[PDB]
């Protein structure tokens, strides 16, 4: 179980800042010492701040930890293309008897314009359905900076299940593309009358939808 | 780490493994140690409390144990996507903090060569009535996560307009990667139809996708 929040995304100009913070509650951030680890792209996830704001060994006093209540927050100054990662709060929750940990927030240092994603929403093919399967496609491309968050729905209900997206990969227009998809049986398909993909990018959310009709 | 973990366990998928934490009388001795997993690129999630108590939806293969001043972590019929880092946690009362062993990386050894499963999927009626048209391949649950990719307009080479993402390891830790190439709506109607080679692990795939009467 997770109460902690962190924005998927920050990023800045590099020689700038950013702030990435997370909130929690009194059971969680505000009783207990947090912690911050940052992972690297295909690198294990190190520690880099303990007790709320000590640097790990290495770290520079660029990278800086504070609390303030129930929310935690990592600041970095002069922002360097090194610093490019994902990074994610850990702390004790003293109610729960275990550790919680923030979503994770990804770093980019901005190295050309920031653009929206284009998103195309493709509804089960012909030829799927007549092997009674059933993909919800969408198609997510030509954004800047390399991270989305997707949230399907059936029906305004929020999808659970059979949801995959990948990591966003850098394209040859040097923009990044990522699909997610949905496997649904013919029924399930069929059961709803429309079917919604929510892209959100930078704080800036975009819906598309489909809906089961013969050609 | 203030808990000591072993640094790595490997095992055949369907095999039984074994995660040990060592602590002392202030931590594991006395408190409910949790297990944690991490999947590569993901956040640690809960999945054993109390010391022997699963998270919900947490598979029966997981079981965990407590004994003195250790507790141990067994993956009972290893699959793929157990494959990650495994921590341990337990409040210490000596230090009245929350403490961590140092991680278990669990490797799945001669893992299984997994095909690709290849959907294509043509320009919808609402993007083509936005004078777009973007073909999407979609390329899921393949391992290893290297795949080769061709497209033909009829029987032709298409050798411009694709891209293809870099594959990525799914929830299962098998690879998806997509490949879309975007058309007029004018070069989507003209041909008989377009196609989609995939080849893996010195196999091919080949999908083909015609334009329909509407």
């Known amino acids: 179980q997770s109460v902690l929040t962190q924005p998927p995304s920050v990023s800045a100009a590099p020689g700038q800042k950013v702030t990435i913070s997370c909130?929690?509650?009194?059971?969680?951030?505000?009783?207990?010492?947090?912690?911050?680890y940052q992972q690297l792209p295909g690198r294990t996830p190190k520690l880099?701040?303990?007790?709320?704001?000590?640097?790990?060994s290495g770290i520079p006093d660029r990278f800086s930890g504070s609390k303030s209540g129930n929310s935690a927050t990592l600041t970095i100054t002069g922002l360097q293309t090194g610093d490019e990662a994902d990074?994610?709060?850990?702390?004790?929750?003293?109610?729960?008897?275990?550790?919680?940990?923030?979503?994770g927030t990804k770093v980019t240092v901005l190295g050309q314009p920031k653009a929206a994603p284009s998103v195309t929403l493709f509804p089960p093919s012909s030829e799927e359905l007549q092997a009674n399967k059933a993909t919800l496609v969408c198609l997510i491309s030509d954004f800047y900076p390399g991270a989305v968050t997707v949230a399907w729905k059936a029906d305004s209900s929020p999808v659970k299940a059979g949801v995959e997206t990948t990591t966003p990969s850098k394209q040859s227009n040097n923009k990044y593309a990522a699909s997610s998809y949905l496997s649904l049986t013919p029924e399930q398909w069929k059961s709803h009358r429309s079917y919604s993909c929510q892209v959100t990018h930078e704080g800036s959310t975009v819906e598309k939808t489909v809906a089961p009709t013969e050609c | 780490s203030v808990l000591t973990q072993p640094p790595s366990v490997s095992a055949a998928p369907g095999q039984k493994v074994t995660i040990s934490c060592?602590?002392?009388?202030?931590?594991?001795?006395?408190?409910?140690?949790?297990?944690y997993q991490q999947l590569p690129g993901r956040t640690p999630k809960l999945?054993?409390?109390?010391?022997?108590?699963?998270?919900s939806g947490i598979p029966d293969r997981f079981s965990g144990s407590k004994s003195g001043n250790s507790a141990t972590l067994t993956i009972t019929g290893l699959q793929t996507g157990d494959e990650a880092d495994?921590?341990?946690?337990?409040?210490?009362?000596?230090?009245?903090?929350?403490?961590?062993?140092?991680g278990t990386k669990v490797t799945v050894l001669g893992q299984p060569k997994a095909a690709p499963s290849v959907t294509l999927f043509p320009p919808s009626s609402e993007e083509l009535q936005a004078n777009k048209a973007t073909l999407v391949c979609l390329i899921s649950d393949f391992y290893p996560g290297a795949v080769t990719v061709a497209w033909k307009a009829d029987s032709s080479p298409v050798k411009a307009g694709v891209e293809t993402t870099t594959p990525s390891k799914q929830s299962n830790n098998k690879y998806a990667a997509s490949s879309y190439l975007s058309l007029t709506p004018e070069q989507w109607k003209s041909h008989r139809s377009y196609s989609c080679q995939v080849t893996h692990e010195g196999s091919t795939v080949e999908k083909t996708v015609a334009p329909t009467e509407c």
């Open positions: 109390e010391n022997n």
């Open positions: 009388n202030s931590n594991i001795g006395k408190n409910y």
């Open positions: 007790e709320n704001n």
């Open positions: 850990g702390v004790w929750d003293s109610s729960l008897s275990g550790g919680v």
């Open positions: 946690g337990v409040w210490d009362s000596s230090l009245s903090g929350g403490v």
């Open positions: 009194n059971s969680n951030i505000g009783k207990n010492y």
